[PDB]
Structures are given as C-alpha cells and as structure tokens.
C-alpha cells in the first residue's frame, strides 16, 4: 500500500 | 555470497541491482544497493568511482534474477549519484564507501510500494546491534573467488557481527578498520560476502526493525579464515545521508 520500511510480505 | 541459499526478491524487497549501459548493446551488473525512501536507493562510491557518468547506469527494483525479468520490476535512471567527499582507497580498506542515487523512471516517478518493492529502516545517530547478532546480507555477487560469471539468482546467507578489538587484531586486518566500519563473519567462516555483492545491505534488527546496518565494501578473499566483510557502518553517516535526501 505505502511503504512500511523494513516489512516483507 | 558463498554459502546462503537462493532466494527470491519478496524476501529483501528493499534490494537495488544497478547496472551499466555500455556502448555496444550490453548491459552489465555493476553493484547492489538499498531503497531508503521513495527515491534514493544507498550502495558505496568504490562502485562509481571509475565511471561517474550517472547517464549510463539503471537501477531496478523487484529483481529476483540478474539478466532475465522478474515481473513486477522497476526500471529507473539515476537523476542523482552523490559520492562521498573523502572517499579514500588504501591497499585494502574503501573509507566513506557509502554513496546516494537518486532515481527517476521515464515517467517522472520515484519507487512505488509493492510486494516485491519495500524501503529498509535507518538506524539512529551511531546506534548499531552488538556483536554477537546475526545479520543477513544479499546480492548477486560471486559464489566463490575463483568464478569470473555471478549467479542468475539472487542470494542470501546469515553472518554475525564481530567487534572492533576482534577485527583489528594485526592477524584479521590491524587498524586498517576503523570505527566507521563494522566487521561481520560466519563462527566457521563458512559463507561470506563477495566481489560483485559491493553496495548491499547488511541487514540486522535493531530496536524491533529490519535496519540497514552495513553496506558490503570490503574484504580479503572470500569466506577466508580471520578476514571477515568489512561494512561502511550506515549509523556513523547519518548526518551526512540526510544533509542530502529530501521529501518524498
Ligand atoms: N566479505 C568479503 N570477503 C568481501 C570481499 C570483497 C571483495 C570485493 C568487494 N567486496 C567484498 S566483501
């Protein structure tokens, strides 16, 4: 969506 | 990286390949580098050094492998390459091996958030992990010295960070390491970083996020015994990265 530094998915 | 195993983007989505253009038809890899924020990605100077000609590299984002396409990825041009003033090159060691570029892609936009494309964290004003923790590095760089090709898939192994007393014993690399370096190794210097991993990140956790905590500059050999990977440390630049990112 928006980029949460550090989070893989 | 010597050891590790292959893996995919969507397991270092923050991950940077740049490459250069040559005149000729080819393109070839040159670096690997980190997304900070929407439109600058970190590596180290040492890659751009020789050539500084920021028109003729691309960066791509979502890339799972080195010459073929991963679907999902991001191509971009650099509108910005900021080495590091003071960057300096003995028989050995790169000091202030970190540097910034600043990416643009053909339509006038920056990086877009996506399951293959993340930013990593910044540490805080000289906060790093303490030895002991483990980190992870990737890249597409060499799988053992003595290749002269890099591997079509991305790689990923696990080293531990070291301390600076340990790395500085005159049978390691003396004082050729200095506080703004981090050392990193593997207890049974088994897998490594490597020639062609230059500019990728050394990811360790910190304070509950994924940090980028060293960027891979240096190192004697490859997973050879009492050498450890030399990392420019990301925390001691802070004031300097920002002095140069901006806005969104
Ligand atoms: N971690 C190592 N032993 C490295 C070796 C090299 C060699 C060239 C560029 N970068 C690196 S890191």
Redesign the pocket.
């Given at each position: 969506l928006k980029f949460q530094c550090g989070q893989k998915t | 990286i010597i050891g590790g195993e292959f893996t995919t983007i969507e397991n270092q989505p923050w991950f940077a390949a740049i490459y250069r253009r040559h005149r000729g038809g080819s393109v070839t890899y040159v670096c690997g580098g980190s997304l900070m924020s929407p439109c600058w990605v970190i590596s180290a100077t040492?890659c751009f050094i020789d050539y500084p000609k920021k028109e003729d590299y691309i960066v791509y984002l979502g890339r799972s492998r080195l010459n073929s396409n991963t679907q999902g990825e991001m191509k971009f041009e650099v509108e910005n390459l900021i080495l590091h003033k003071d960057y300096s090159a003995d028989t050995l060691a790169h000091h202030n091996d970190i540097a910034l570029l600043k990416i643009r892609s053909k339509e006038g936009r920056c990086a877009q958030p996506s399951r293959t494309i993340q930013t990593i964290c910044l540490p805080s004003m000289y906060n790093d992990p303490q030895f002991g923790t483990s980190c992870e590095i990737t890249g597409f760089?060499k799988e053992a010295?003595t290749d002269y090709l890099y591997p079509e898939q991305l790689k990923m192994t696990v080293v531990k960070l070291i301390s600076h007393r340990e790395c500085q014993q005159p049978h390691y690399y003396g004082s050729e390491v200095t506080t703004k370096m981090l050392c990193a190794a593997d207890p049974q210097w088994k897998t490594?970083?490597?020639?062609?991993?230059?500019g990728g990140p050394l990811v360790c956790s910190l304070q509950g996020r994924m940090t980028l905590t060293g960027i891979?500059?240096?190192?004697?050999?490859?997973?050879?015994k009492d050498?450890?990977?030399?990392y420019t440390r990301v925390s001691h630049f802070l004031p300097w990265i920002r002095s140069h990112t901006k806005e969104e």
């Open positions: - | 040492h760089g010295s490594d970083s490597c020639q062609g991993d230059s891979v500059s240096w190192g004697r050999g490859c997973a050879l050498k450890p990977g030399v």
